[PDB]
C-alpha cells in the first residue's frame, strides 16, 4: 500500500514499505474484526402468531421486531460508514507520516 520509487544511476523501480503496510493491515483487520464482533443482533427463530382478539400484542410484537431490526440496521450502516471514513483518513496519514519520516 505504501512505498517508494527511486531513480538513480544504477536503475529505477518501485519498492514497497512492508512495515507500514503490515501495520496498516494490523489496524484494518482489527477494524473488520471489531465491526463483526460488536454487533449483537438476536436471532428470531419462529415468528409468533396471534388470533383476532390479540391485536394489541400483535402490534406490539411487530413494533419490537421492526424496531430492533431498524436499530441494528442503523448501527451497522453507521459503524461501517464511520470506520470507512477513519480508514480513508488513516491511509492518508500513513502516507504523510512516511513522507515526514523521509523528510526528517
Amino acid at each position, epitope marked *: 500500500w505504501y512505498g517508494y520509487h527511486h531513480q538513480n544511476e544504477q536503475g529505477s*523501480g518501485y519498492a514497497a514499505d512492508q512495515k507500514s*503496510t*503490515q501495520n496498516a*493491515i494490523n489496524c484494518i483487520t482489527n477494524k473488520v474484526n471489531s465491526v463483526i464482533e460488536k454487533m449483537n443482533t438476536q436471532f428470531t427463530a419462529v415468528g409468533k402468531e396471534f388470533n383476532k382478539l390479540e391485536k394489541r400484542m400483535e402490534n406490539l410484537n411487530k413494533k419490537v421486531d421492526d424496531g430492533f431490526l431498524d436499530i441494528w440496521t442503523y448501527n451497522a450502516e453507521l459503524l461501517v460508514l464511520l470506520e470507512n471514513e477513519r480508514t480513508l483518513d488513516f491511509h492518508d496519514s500513513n502516507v504523510k507520516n512516511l513522507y515526514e519520516k523521509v523528510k526528517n
Partner: antibody, heavy 128, light 105 residues
Framework: QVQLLESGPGLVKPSQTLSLTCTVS??????????WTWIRQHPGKGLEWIAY???????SYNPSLRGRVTISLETSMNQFSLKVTSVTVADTALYFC???????????????????????WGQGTMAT | DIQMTQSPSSLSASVGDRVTITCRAS??????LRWYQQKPGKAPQCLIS???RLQSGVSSRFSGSGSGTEFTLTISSLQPEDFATYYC?????????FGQGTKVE
C-alpha cells in the same frame, strides 16, 4: 485452492543444466505481494534456500549460489522456473517451490481473499 | 550473511510434555522469523509467521515469542502427530537462511 505443481528432469549428468519449473494452478502467479521461492533439501540434511522472484521483478539468490542459478517468472504460462548450471554431487536435493506471502493477512484486507494470505508449498521433486 | 543457530538439535519427549525450541540470530532480526514444521515424507508448512503470529490451519498449541537475536518456539503439549523437524527461517535481510533443524522424538 491454489496449488503448486513441479516438473523436474529427475536425472541429469554432472556439469549440465538442471531446469526445474513450478506450475501454479488454481491462482495467478502475476499477483503482487508474494515471494515465489525455491527451497532445496539435501537428503538426510536440512532445508536450504536458493532464490525468490516477485511479479514486481525482484529476485534474490543465495550467496553460495549467486552466479550459478537463475530464477524466472513466466507470467503468460502461469509458472516460475529455476535453472541450475554446473550440476555437481552437492546439487542433488529434494527441491520445493513455495509461495511465501509478503504480509500476514488472515481476512484478505490486502490479498483480497482469505486464502491469499496463505503460504503454500510444492510437494517436492527429486533431482539426481 | 545472517547465520542462524537453533537449539537443541536433538530433542526427545513423550506425549503431553512441553518443550521449547530456541533459534538464535547473528544480527538483529526484527520480528521477521518464520517457523516451519517438516513431517517426514511431507512438504514443510509454516506455523508461526512474524515470530509471534499463528498461521491458519495451525493449532493453538504452537506459540512463538522473542525479538532481535533470540526467539522461542514452545509446543504446549506434544501429540503423536507432532513428530517433525522444526526450522527457523529469517527474511529480514534479502538473503534468507534456514536453521539447521531440531528433530523432536
Amino acid at each position: 485452492q491454489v496449488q503448486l505443481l513441479e516438473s523436474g528432469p529427475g536425472l541429469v549428468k554432472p556439469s549440465q543444466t538442471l531446469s526445474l519449473t513450478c506450475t501454479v494452478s488454481g491462482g495467478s502467479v502475476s499477483r503482487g505481494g508474494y515471494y515465489w521461492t525455491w527451497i532445496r533439501q539435501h537428503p538426510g540434511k536440512g532445508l536450504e534456500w536458493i532464490a525468490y522472484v516477485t511479479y514486481s521483478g525482484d529476485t534474490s539468490y543465495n550467496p553460495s549460489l549467486r552466479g550459478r542459478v537463475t530464477i524466472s517468472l513466466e507470467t503468460s504460462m502461469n509458472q516460475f522456473s529455476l535453472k541450475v548450471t554446473s550440476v555437481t554431487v552437492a546439487d542433488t536435493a529434494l527441491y520445493f517451490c513455495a509461495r511465501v506471502p509478503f504480509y500476514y493477512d488472515t481476512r484478505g484486507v490486502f490479498y483480497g481473499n482469505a486464502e491469499g494470505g496463505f503460504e503454500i508449498w510444492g510437494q517436492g521433486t527429486m533431482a539426481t | 550473511d545472517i547465520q542462524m543457530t537453533q537449539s537443541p538439535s536433538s530433542l526427545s519427549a513423550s506425549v503431553g510434555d512441553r518443550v521449547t525450541i530456541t533459534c538464535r540470530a547473528s544480527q538483529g532480526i526484527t520480528n521477521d522469523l518464520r517457523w516451519y514444521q517438516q513431517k517426514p515424507g511431507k512438504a514443510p508448512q509454516c506455523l508461526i509467521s512474524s515470530a509471534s503470529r499463528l498461521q491458519s490451519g495451525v493449532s493453538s498449541r504452537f506459540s512463538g515469542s522473542g525479538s532481535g537475536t533470540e526467539f522461542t518456539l514452545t509446543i504446549s503439549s506434544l501429540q503423536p502427530e507432532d513428530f517433525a523437524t522444526y526450522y527457523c527461517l529469517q527474511h529480514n535481510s534479502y538473503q534468507w537462511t534456514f536453521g539447521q533443524g531440531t528433530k523432536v522424538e
